[PDB]
Design a protein around this ligand. Structure first.
Ligand SMILES: *[C@@H]1O[C@H](CO)[C@@H](O[C@@H]2O[C@H](CO)[C@@H](O)[C@H](O)[C@H]2NC(C)=O)[C@H](O)[C@H]1NC(C)=O
Lengths: 215, 107, 225, 97
């Protein structure tokens, strides 16, 4: 059992610069049989380098591998927009083999203030016995952001899944949606529902709320 | 993205001594709508059944709890036309509803 | 060299799952060549299930030992995978690859297939209107969405049209999340404020193309101007 | 430096409370003060001044709230405009009253 941990989880790079990916192994690998893989969301993963030193057919020469033992580093010269995908390091000397956590690289951009909107549940949806309150964040950077739900001054926990979109191809920004789920009877026992959004580019937190019956 | 109210039509006319300048003297007419919602509104001037297509300027709608707006329009008129007992009518179109107000110099 | 996967798109928990990896253009006769299965749950990394070498040599993962079986049929040139004791947390997309030697591992990858493991049934999606309650801050623009709920499997495409059947470029698609045995997703659209204060059209239609029904609910705009 | 024109509008002869509008146009510079008078007495409340707008010339409009009964009682209303140290007074009254 060889545990592979990759750090950092997310890194922000710029086109044309150099990116270094680190792969940590829990023990030495015989014959340095470590390979790297490239995977794009939607499509299928593709092999780039096998044995950490030999490239495969149809792979550009800008990808270079180095290191041995328990430390391996992947260096890429001439970063391209299409290369901002997730990369995994894997060793095939274990039998059975194991895969690492993987690292995601994003395009570096400036900080943009997000937009917060809250939609109260519709009357038709209330008839089904389930109420869904959404909290939308759009055009923010970096991806790291805290979304907290506060209703009647009581902080909620253990009831938010949280969905986040991928990086925009033309805007390079991120968006996420937070959904509040509660019982219909519990909904009638609360008046004000608000989600708090905290951002690095905002001096003070912005809070949005609504009054039951006015929407 | 609370209430809807029908627009109110008010017409302002110059007094008997409100005409000045070289002969022929000219004055202005003011038609204003207040406490109306939604914002869009159409302002037109009618003179003895004839639409006025020149000599008028309408100020942009500005904000004066239901939201309220106000609109100010100015039409240039001649003293001779006023003395001929001509009737000036302000045409207001709002959400498909038409409101007309008739004013005259007769007591 | 190419690979193709196939199997059921919906399987109930605590049952038997069977997948077939269809490959053509090579034979599993030379040494080093082998076939392996790799799965990846959404939002997670790749997971190694098992690998089979030549001469009927098979390897299994100790974490999943005594739970998977590997069988090969040279006549049909396709490996058969059997999965028992299905669990909702094990839902992932399964891929198969060919190793062209001892050092070149997984040189060619196929396309994969989504195998959803949910106790529920493939019911028609349910749409719910969304009315914005924002006030005292019109800002640059406003947003309006459409709550597609209770759909399975997750395959939905969103298109926004006006009352006069116009075209809108939203491109805002949120991924689905498993909540209470069902996938839930939300879709929004950004529209300029100036266009809202213009045409008398007070509503737009939300359209979803799911292979369980062609319902389309409309969201009435509140109009601000 | 041009003296601003003083004009006061009156309600229609055949009926409409109402408002009084005093307009000063073609004046320079932009700052200007507009007040209202009632029978030669200073008005302390019931009047508002709109922000000065650009028609270089500027335009300023003022609104005075009046009652229907007092207007036709031959009350004297005067719009006072102060500009460049000059004061302009205009007296208006109802034609039919
Ligand atoms: C459907 O109605 C909308 C009204 O909301 C039309 O949008 C207007 O027309 C122009 C020209 O197409 C658009 O670019 C603008 O968004 C709208 N105009 C203004 C002034 O805001 C839309 O064009 C209509 N569809 C068709 C096919 O005519």
């Amino acid at each position: 059992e060889i545990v592979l941990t990759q750090s950092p989880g997310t890194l922000s790079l710029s086109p044309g610069e150099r990116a270094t990916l680190s792969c940590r192994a829990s023990e030495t690998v015989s014959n340095d049989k470590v390979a790297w893989y490239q995977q794009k969301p939607g499509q299928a993963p593709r092999l780039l380098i096998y044995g950490a030193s030999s490239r495969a057919t149809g792979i550009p020469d800008r990808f270079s591998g180095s290191g041995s033992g328990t430390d391996f580093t992947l260096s890429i010269s001439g970063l391209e927009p299409e290369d901002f995908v997730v990369y995994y390091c894997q060793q095939y000397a274990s039998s059975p083999r194991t895969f690492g956590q993987g690292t995601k690289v994003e395009i570096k951009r400036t900080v943009a203030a997000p937009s917060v909107f809250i939609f109260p549940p519709s009357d038709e949806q209330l008839k089904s016995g389930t109420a869904s309150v959404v909290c939308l964040l759009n055009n923010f950077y970096p991806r790291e952001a805290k979304v907290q739900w506060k209703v009647d001054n009581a902080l909620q926990s253990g009831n938010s899944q949280e969905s986040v979109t991928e990086q925009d191809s033309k805007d390079s920004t991120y968006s996420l949606s937070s959904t509040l789920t509660l019982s219909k009877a519990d909904y009638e026992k609360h008046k004000v529902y608000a989600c708090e959004v905290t951002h690095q580019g905002l001096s003070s937190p912005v809070t949005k709320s609504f009054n039951r019956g006015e929407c | 993205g609370v209430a809807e109210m029908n627009p109110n039509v008010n017409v302002f006319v110059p007094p008997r001594d409100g005409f000045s300048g070289p002969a022929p003297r000219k004055s202005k007419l003011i038609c204003e709508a207040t406490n109306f919602t939604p914002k869009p509104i159409t302002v037109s001037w009618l003179k003895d059944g004839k639409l006025v297509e020149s000599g008028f300027t309408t100020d942009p709608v500005t904000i004066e709890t239901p939201q309220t707006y106000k609109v100010i329009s100015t039409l240039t008129i001649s003293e001779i036309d006023w003395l001929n007992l001509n009737v000036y009518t302000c045409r207001v179109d709002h959400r498909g509803l038409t409101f007309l107000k008739n004013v005259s110099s007769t007591c | 060299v190419t690979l193709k996967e196939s199997g059921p798109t919906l399987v109930k928990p605590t049952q038997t799952l069977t997948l077939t990896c269809t490959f053509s253009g090579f034979s599993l006769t030379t040494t080093g060549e082998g076939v392996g299965w790799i799965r990846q749950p959404p939002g997670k990394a790749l997971e190694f299930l098992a690998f089979i070498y030549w001469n009927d040599a098979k390897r299994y993962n100790p974490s999943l030992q005594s739970r998977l079986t590997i069988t090969k049929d040279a006549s049909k040139k396709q490996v058969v995978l059997t999965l028992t004791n299905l669990d909702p947390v094990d839902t992932a997309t399964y891929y198969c690859a060919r190793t062209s030697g001892w050092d070149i591992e997984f040189e060619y990858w196929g396309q994969g297939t989504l195998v959803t493991v949910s106790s529920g049934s493939a019911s028609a999606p349910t749409l719910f209107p969304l009315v914005s309650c924002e006030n005292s801050s019109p800002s640059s623009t406003v947003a309006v969405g459409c709550l597609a709920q209770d759909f399975l499997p997750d395959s939905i495409t969103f298109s926004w049209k006006y009352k006069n059947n116009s075209d809108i470029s939203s491109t805002r698609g949120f991924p689905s999340v498993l909540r209470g045995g069902k996938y839930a997703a939300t879709s929004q659209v950004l529209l300029p404020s100036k266009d809202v204060m213009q045409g008398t059209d007070e509503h737009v239609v939300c359209k979803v193309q799911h292979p369980n029904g062609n319902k389309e609910k409309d969201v009435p705009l509140p109009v601000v101007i």
